[PDB]
Design a protein around this ligand. Structure first.
Ligand SMILES: *C(=C)C1=C(C)[C@@H](Cc2[nH]c(/C=C3N=C(/C=C4\NC(=O)[C@H](C)[C@H]4[C@@H](*)C)C(C)=C\3CCC(=O)O)c(CCC(=O)O)c2C)NC1=O
Ligand SMILES: *[C@@H](C)[C@H]1/C(=C/C2=NC(=C\c3[nH]c(C[C@H]4NC(=O)C(C=C)=C4C)c(C)c3CCC(=O)O)/C(CCC(=O)O)=C2C)NC(=O)[C@@H]1C
Ligand SMILES: *[C@@H](C)[C@H]1/C(=C/C2=NC(=C\c3[nH]c(C[C@H]4NC(=O)C(C=C)=C4C)c(C)c3CCC(=O)O)/C(CCC(=O)O)=C2C)NC(=O)[C@@H]1C
Ligand SMILES: *[C@@H](C)[C@H]1/C(=C/C2=NC(=C\c3[nH]c(C[C@H]4NC(=O)C(C=C)=C4C)c(C)c3CCC(=O)O)/C(CCC(=O)O)=C2C)NC(=O)[C@@H]1C
Ligand SMILES: *[C@H](C)[C@H]1/C(=C/C2=NC(=C\c3[nH]c(C[C@H]4NC(=O)C(C=C)=C4C)c(C)c3CCC(=O)O)/C(CCC(=O)O)=C2C)NC(=O)[C@@H]1C
Ligand SMILES: *[C@H](C)[C@H]1/C(=C/C2=NC(=C\c3[nH]c(C[C@H]4NC(=O)C(C=C)=C4C)c(C)c3CCC(=O)O)/C(CCC(=O)O)=C2C)NC(=O)[C@@H]1C
Ligand SMILES: *[C@H](C)[C@H]1/C(=C/C2=NC(=C\c3[nH]c(C[C@H]4NC(=O)C(C=C)=C4C)c(C)c3CCC(=O)O)/C(CCC(=O)O)=C2C)NC(=O)[C@@H]1C
Ligand SMILES: *[C@H](C)[C@H]1/C(=C/C2=NC(=C\c3[nH]c(C[C@H]4NC(=O)C(C=C)=C4C)c(C)c3CCC(=O)O)/C(CCC(=O)O)=C2C)NC(=O)[C@@H]1C
Ligand SMILES: *[C@H](C)[C@H]1/C(=C/C2=NC(=C\c3[nH]c(C[C@H]4NC(=O)C(C=C)=C4C)c(C)c3CCC(=O)O)/C(CCC(=O)O)=C2C)NC(=O)[C@@H]1C
Ligand SMILES: C=CC1=C(C)[C@@H](Cc2[nH]c(/C=C3N=C(/C=C4\NC(=O)[C@H](C)[C@H]4CC)C(C)=C\3CCC(=O)O)c(CCC(=O)O)c2C)NC1=O
Ligand SMILES: C=CC1=C(C)[C@@H](Cc2[nH]c(/C=C3N=C(/C=C4\NC(=O)[C@H](C)[C@H]4CC)C(C)=C\3CCC(=O)O)c(CCC(=O)O)c2C)NC1=O
Ligand SMILES: C=CC1=C(C)[C@@H](Cc2[nH]c(/C=C3N=C(/C=C4\NC(=O)[C@H](C)[C@H]4CC)C(C)=C\3CCC(=O)O)c(CCC(=O)O)c2C)NC1=O
Ligand SMILES: C=CC1=C(C)[C@@H](Cc2[nH]c(/C=C3N=C(/C=C4\NC(=O)[C@H](C)[C@H]4CC)C(C)=C\3CCC(=O)O)c(CCC(=O)O)c2C)NC1=O
Ligand SMILES: C=CC1=C(C)[C@@H](Cc2[nH]c(/C=C3N=C(/C=C4\NC(=O)[C@H](C)[C@H]4CC)C(C)=C\3CCC(=O)O)c(CCC(=O)O)c2C)NC1=O
Lengths: 92, 177, 248, 164, 164, 177, 164, 177
């Protein structure tokens, strides 16, 4: 009840400011993924490179495989989390 | 905040079952050893200031860098707070042993304890030891096999209740890990 | 800071289970559930409103602050939402004087009485710059509210032992009455108003009606006057071996 | 949940105290009444669909106007939902006999029920006429025990005072 | 005054409720465990001169340093105030065995005792050594009954724990 | 508050005396018929919803100028606050029948009540009649001499329990007089 | 009292401010509308015993079970109390036309409504069976004005919304 | 609150005067003997725990009915509250000796103290006796004429500080009488 671990109205500040450095970083992610697709197929005609599906309606089958292979990047250990931060920075 | 009589009914509102003759044998085997449970709870709370102080000082003599400068139990302000903390943990496990249900320990004590220790730097490798010292001292005072303080009991078997209060110290050491 | 009355002769203060649910990753609090939740709400209604005994169609306008109290389990936010209500200003602001409203804010939200005229006049300095909500949020966001209650417990009337003035204990005992009293019986007029602005004290029988059971409530009264004479200069002498020395 | 065990360990936690000798004396009273308040719950599990079928068709004996249109039970799917809300209470009377306190009654079947039965225009005074039909039809020396009678009738009388 | 009756209605008043059917079971434990704590209390009342004569000189056989100049028992009224303060403590142990809870101990003997005994240099380890002498002086078929020794040696080490 | 065991303790602490063998024949004869204290506090709070309603409705039928304008239980907000005041008076009597002593009735209810019933204009001469109607109804529940609600009891007498609670209704009936 | 003059000066007193132009613009609504709601105040105060003779029996011509023994109106002297209690609602619907608000309706008739009708078992859905008959007997041209029929049928269904 | 320099300028504010060289020769000797004022107050706060417990137990010695059943220093609950109170009184007269004006003792400690004591039941004749022992043991430490505990000072008279603090202890008796 002492010793400023106990607090209020900064407690709802921090849950509404850690997202502001998070979901204004997926606006960075959703529009730097778009940046190299504005040079891959840079016109309305699609390239040979941007093919997802070939057959069978398999674009859904990779959509089931895309959203659960990037589920397995936040489903990673804290020793594996910090390896993804200090060395992808050094590649950047 | 549920006791062991209030666990069989919250497993039965999901089915909306009238609780009848099936699961009432499990509560008649609660009041058979009810005086065995009451004789077991009283033995912890009669030795509780010695159970804490042997545990926390045994953590120092098993890990002598805790009282170095920079250590977590270094100064008198910090040493009083660890003794305060283990007196809360032994109080909340004894609430769970009397009720027969771990839902007095997990909500009022274990909710947020893992994030608080890493926010304060309190190391969990010593508190897994000092919880597990008084885990082994709790089954001595139940099964009367302690070295000192042979308490007076009635002759029967209490090795189910000693193992049941071992599981409440497994719920502590899982959560603070 | 020992205080021989507090957890001995009174009860223990009510409140939420802990303050560690705020730092939890997957909850907000040790969740009580609606048997040990609403009996905390019974002690906030009894403390903030006095014993006003609000009816069913007066409790129906506080449904929005209760439904938020069972989501955020903060007790400071429930007290703040109940003091800006219509049911708090129609009982303690509408038909009362200004220092009657101020002396009940110290009772309902701090559990003490005001210690000074200078502390009381600064509460009317906040009325001029924001009305009655500037008084209420400055009590709630004070340092004295933080280091006694926090978000965790109901703001109760606390016997401290180490009061910063002795008169603060006296005005606390007049404001908090006995059980089954309320805050509407004096017709709007402030009880402590003459003693704050003059610097005198209270009446001994009004304080000893509010003391707990087991405290010798009222003995010690000599049958002469109950207060002190400020103009009297008595001679108090000590015996030395030779005579009597009046170190005045 | 309101029980006899949850009172004495929340009153110990509120003062920061270990469970002392007066708490363990109160668990000893739970061992005494458990031959009667548990034996009555055993009888209210297999004979439950003949006391819930004695009540509601004699609820409509004193209340004849509830079969009239504009009132509650004007079609057949509401009377079958009127026999649901008394099987919802005898299942909760059966629970609080098992846990000893008034926990399953007060925080499931009582809390909020003043406002649903106000807004949805259902009369509370036919629930009082139907729960009390299970009181006076209950006799002791054939069906249940002596102290199973005085524990069952004290739990039918709890929510009679809560609905009134 | 924490008793069994003065806790179940200090919780019935804290929620504004009637005497519940929970709390009528907690006084049914007051009927069962009375006859071991009354018979432990009545044994202490006719034997109290002999048990506090033995408990008091267990302090002074152990701690001979207390008669030094400036220590706790340095003159004869301090020895008389030492045997008074262990006559007071086991009178409160006799009181706790009547009301069934630890109420008379922590209102009249324990509250304040950390602050009183520190200021007057009265050692806590000499107060403990007198009370812990008579905790294992108890002989469970000879002195009192089997369960009557459980009640009497529950309030004794409640006082040894709260002093230490 | 003090119950009936703690009253005997605070009498003997005034003497600084141990609770001997003479006072324990009044406390072994408290718990001997102590089933009947539990077996009759149950037959107040089972009928306590009807008991407060028949109390104040008979207060109207003998002072019919209460519902006149100017009268105290004239409107609907005052008739509701009169109804809950009979609830609080009946609640702290049923605590004191459970405790055996009027300590919780006098400190938590009756302290300062006539002081404030003149401060709100409550006519106390007809508030006494509100108490004494439900005084008469409670002592015939305990005696089992009511017309309706013949609650099944065990055979004997509760003639002293009927008169101990009639002393409790006369304590409130003399406090506001 | 909740009306338009008090609400703008309670809010001015809550903020420590002088009455400014926001307040004076609202009392101009108490000049253009107040000519119309005294047309129903003058209409009700000379007609009301011919209303509550005819309003009240339409409850009984909707619910004839109240005169049965065990119910409320089982004798003639509680029919007179039934006819008295609706004239309180008619006098308070007259009083709230004059101040122009819900001010003396709620704190004199609706505060404490659910409490005193549930202990006395006067069912609240038969108080609305009289006033919904009164709301449908108010005809538009002959009884009062068109704007007076709006304000008379704006306080009738404040009360039958707060009675359910 | 005020100190010895603030007391002079509120006297001159009643006449709208300037604090000139006639009035300043009392304040020029307050700073001239100002070393001895500091040298006297750590003669008191260095001995303050011995001073309280001797004064309270020396009041028990001349009045043994304070520790019998019915005295107001009876149990541990009441005796620790008496020991706390005599430490509060000695704290506020060490503030007043340091300032050189008895303002802060008179409004914070002593204002309203008489009404607390006649509501709690505190005997005021024996409470004056505990203050008058610690008045007499405060002039012994200042003039260095105590029977144990000679402290190391410099030579001269402190005989006007010893009677200034004796008048601060006399205001406590005049305010609770
Ligand atoms: C530091 C050098 C050091 C210690 C301190 C000590 C810590 C420790 N103690 C045990 C064992 C027990 N503790 C017990 C409890 C008590 N002992 C008593 O005599 C009284 C009654 C009471 C409180 C003081 C008891 C009875 C034991 C013996 C085992 C048992 O429980 O019966 C351990 C062992 C825990 C384990 O390894 O299982 C430790 C680490 N040891 C130190 O090295
Ligand atoms: C008949 C059409 C009704 C019905 C009516 C009954 N009401 C009874 C008593 C009663 N009514 C009121 C409310 C009334 N008094 C007020 O002052 C105001 C607002 C200003 C109102 C609306 C009160 C307070 C009471 C109780 C006190 C009293 O009797 O004066 C009543 C008698 C019951 C009794 O004996 O107490 C009856 C029969 N009952 C019905 O079933 C239909 C719907
Ligand atoms: C703590 C021991 C200090 C200390 C304090 C001094 N006490 C002084 C005088 C004094 N003390 C008592 C109480 C004593 N007398 C008793 O009869 C009893 C028991 C019943 C006790 C405990 C009294 C009554 C007095 C005299 C006051 C008076 O006359 O009214 C004192 C004054 C001078 C002296 O005697 O030394 C001091 C300084 N003495 C110490 O040295 C340690 C530091
Ligand atoms: C009467 C109470 C004594 C006594 C007192 C004298 N003390 C004198 C000087 C003195 N005391 C101190 C220490 C004091 N000054 C501080 O600033 C602080 C703390 C920050 C303390 C505790 C000092 C520094 C001095 C000044 C001399 C020096 O610097 O060494 C003193 C001399 C008169 C004067 O200069 O004011 C006297 C007479 N001597 C006695 O015999 C009685 C018992
Ligand atoms: C002791 C065996 C540990 C240890 C403990 C320390 N804990 C410190 C502070 C602290 N501990 C808690 C958790 C405690 N409070 C509760 O309410 C409950 C259960 C419901 C528990 C377990 C809290 C909330 C706090 C913060 C409050 C405070 O600081 O007083 C602490 C002091 C940290 C500091 O001084 O900053 C210590 C030393 N440390 C150890 O080495 C062993 C493993
Ligand atoms: C396992 C820990 C022991 C052992 C335990 C047994 N204890 C038995 C009985 C027993 N204990 C008590 C006292 C207990 N009941 C209470 O109501 C309270 C406090 C309020 C306490 C502390 C009682 C009354 C009894 C019942 C026997 C009697 O009345 O004399 C027991 C017998 C069976 C049972 O009733 O539980 C056993 C086996 N004995 C052991 O072998 C280990 C060491
Ligand atoms: C009914 C249409 C829904 C439904 C509703 C439930 N809501 C519950 C809690 C709840 N509701 C709100 C929103 C509302 N309350 C407010 O105070 C405000 C803002 C002023 C709004 C818009 C809140 C904030 C809460 C949380 C506070 C609380 O715990 O009551 C609720 C209870 C759940 C619980 O107890 O945790 C229910 C059942 N749920 C449904 O299924 C239907 C569709
Ligand atoms: C004997 C085991 C001790 C010892 C004790 C001394 N105690 C002294 C005083 C004392 N004892 C108590 C507690 C006692 N008084 C009560 O009223 C009650 C409960 C009803 C209890 C348990 C108090 C409060 C006091 C102080 C006041 C007084 O004089 O009565 C004492 C005298 C203190 C002194 O020296 O100034 C002694 C010597 N002496 C021993 O050697 C062992 C440790
Ligand atoms: C000891 C020398 C006396 C004595 C003292 C008792 N005082 C008791 C309570 C108490 N005392 C005060 C005043 C004190 N507190 C302050 O904050 C200030 C000024 C800053 C002062 C002077 C207060 C306010 C209180 C009540 C607050 C509380 O303790 O919670 C007391 C307890 C009475 C009881 O238990 O009923 C005692 C025994 N009594 C004596 O006999 C000697 C003479
Ligand atoms: C724990 C102690 C305790 C009590 C005993 C009651 C006592 C009590 N009653 C009332 C308040 C009241 N009490 C009555 C009671 C009566 N008037 C009559 O005509 C009858 C004779 C009698 C009971 C039937 C009425 C009518 C009011 C309402 C007065 C008002 O609204 O101002 C109030 C003021 C509450 C408030 O509004 O702020 C209090 C403290 N409440 C308590 O807290
Ligand atoms: C646990 C809930 C429970 C109850 C509330 C009662 C209710 C009840 N009564 C009867 C059925 C009966 N119950 C009785 C008993 C009596 N009739 C009297 O008037 C006498 C006072 C009393 C003797 C003790 C009789 C005689 C019948 C058959 C007649 C009837 O239909 O009531 C039945 C049908 C099956 C049966 O006989 O048990 C049920 C469920 N029984 C229960 O099991
Ligand atoms: C009110 C509670 C109460 C008690 C706790 C005891 C405490 C107690 N024990 C003994 C006294 C004794 N008690 C015993 C019994 C035993 N000693 C042992 O070594 C064995 C452990 C045990 C046998 C089982 C013996 C042998 C004596 C005599 C030795 C002595 O003088 O202490 C005496 C002295 C009186 C006497 O000799 O009978 C007292 C007061 N008596 C009480 O009235
Ligand atoms: C003016 C209008 C008017 C009334 C409303 C009633 C009110 C009323 N009822 C009773 C009288 C009673 N009230 C009850 C109580 C109950 N009875 C039951 O059947 C239920 C189980 C329980 C709650 C309703 C009982 C049992 C009696 C009879 C006397 C008794 O046996 O105690 C008495 C007598 C009290 C006395 O003598 O002082 C009065 C005044 N009488 C009136 O003249
Ligand atoms: C948890 C809740 C709880 C209860 C409700 C009571 C239930 C209860 N009452 C009695 C028992 C009794 N009850 C009565 C009482 C009466 N008989 C009469 O004819 C009088 C009208 C009435 C007086 C008020 C009597 C006379 C006894 C038996 C004698 C006794 O032991 O007191 C008994 C003992 C069994 C028996 O002796 O038959 C029990 C368990 N006890 C509890 O623990």
């Amino acid at each position: 009840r002492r010793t400023v671990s106990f607090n209020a109205r900064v407690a709802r500040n921090k849950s509404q400011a850690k997202k502001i450095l998070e979901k204004a970083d997926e606006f960075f992610a959703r529009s730097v993924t778009m940046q190299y697709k504005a040079f891959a197929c840079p016109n309305g005609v699609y390239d040979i490179q941007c093919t997802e599906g070939t057959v069978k309606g398999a674009a859904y089958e990779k959509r089931a495989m895309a959203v659960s292979a990037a589920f397995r990047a936040k489903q990673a250990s804290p020793a594996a989390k910090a390896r993804a931060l200090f060395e992808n920075r050094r590649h950047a | 905040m549920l006791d062991a009589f209030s666990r069989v009914v919250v497993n039965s509102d999901a089915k909306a079952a009238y609780v009848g003759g099936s699961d009432l044998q499990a509560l008649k085997s609660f009041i058979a050893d009810g005086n065995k449970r009451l004789d077991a709870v009283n033995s912890i709370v009669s030795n509780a200031s010695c159970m804490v102080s042997d545990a926390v000082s045994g953590m120092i003599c098993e890990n002598p860098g805790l009282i170095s400068p920079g250590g977590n139990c270094y100064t008198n302000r910090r040493m009083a707070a660890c003794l305060r903390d283990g007196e809360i943990i032994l109080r909340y496990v004894s609430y769970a042993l009397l009720a027969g249900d771990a839902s007095v320990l997990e909500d009022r004590c274990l909710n947020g304890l893992k994030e608080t220790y890493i926010a304060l730097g309190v190391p969990t490798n010593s508190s897994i030891r000092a919880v597990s010292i008084m885990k082994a001292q709790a089954v001595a005072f139940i099964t009367n096999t302690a070295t000192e303080r042979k308490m007076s009991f009635a002759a029967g078997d209490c090795t189910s209740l000693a193992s049941e209060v071992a599981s409440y110290f497994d719920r502590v050491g899982a959560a603070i890990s | 800071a020992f205080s021989s009355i507090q957890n001995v002769l009174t009860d223990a203060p009510l409140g939420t289970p802990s303050a560690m649910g705020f730092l939890d990753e997957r909850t907000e609090k040790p969740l009580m559930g609606p048997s040990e939740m609403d009996e905390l709400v019974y002690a906030v209604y009894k403390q903030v409103f006095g014993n006003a005994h609000i009816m069913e169609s007066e409790r129906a306008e506080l449904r929005d602050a209760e439904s938020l109290f069972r989501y955020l389990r903060d007790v400071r936010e429930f007290v703040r939402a109940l003091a800006k209500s219509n049911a708090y200003t129609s009982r303690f602001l509408q038909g009362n004087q200004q220092y009657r409203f101020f002396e009940l804010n110290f009772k309902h939200l701090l559990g003490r009485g005001p210690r000074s005229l200078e502390e009381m006049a600064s509460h009317s300095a906040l009325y001029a710059e924001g009305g009655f909500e500037a008084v209420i949020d400055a009590i709630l966001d004070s340092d004295e509210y933080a280091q006694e209650f926090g978000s965790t417990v109901v703001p109760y009337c606390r016997f401290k032992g180490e009061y910063p003035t002795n008169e603060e204990f006296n005005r606390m005992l007049v404001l908090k009455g006995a059980n089954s009293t309320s805050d509407k019986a004096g017709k709007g007029r402030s009880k402590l108003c003459y003693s704050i602005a003059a610097g005198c004290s209270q009446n001994w029988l009004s304080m000893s009606k509010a003391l707990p059971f087991g405290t010798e409530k009222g003995t010690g009264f000599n049958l002469i006057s109950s207060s002190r004479n400020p103009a009297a200069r008595p001679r108090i002498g000590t015996k030395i071996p030779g005579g009597v020395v009046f170190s005045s | 949940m309101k029980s006899v065990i949850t009172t004495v360990v929340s009153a110990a936690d509120a003062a920061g105290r270990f469970p002392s000798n007066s708490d363990l004396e109160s668990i000893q009273g739970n061992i005494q009444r458990s031959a009667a308040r548990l034996e009555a719950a055993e009888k209210l599990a297999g004979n439950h669909e003949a006391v819930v079928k004695e009540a509601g068709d004699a609820c409509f004996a004193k209340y004849a106007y509830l079969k009239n249109p504009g009132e509650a039970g004007e079609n057949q799917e509401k009377i079958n939902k009127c026999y649901r809300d008394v099987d919802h209470y005898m299942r909760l009377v059966n629970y609080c006999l098992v846990v000893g306190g008034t926990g399953p009654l007060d925080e499931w079947g009582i809390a909020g029920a003043r406002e649903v039965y106000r807004t949805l225009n259902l009369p509370t005074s036919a629930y009082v006429a139907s729960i009390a039909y299970t009181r006076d039809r209950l006799c002791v020396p054939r069906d249940m025990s002596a102290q199973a009678g005085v524990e069952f009738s004290a739990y039918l009388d709890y929510l009679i005072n809560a609905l009134s």
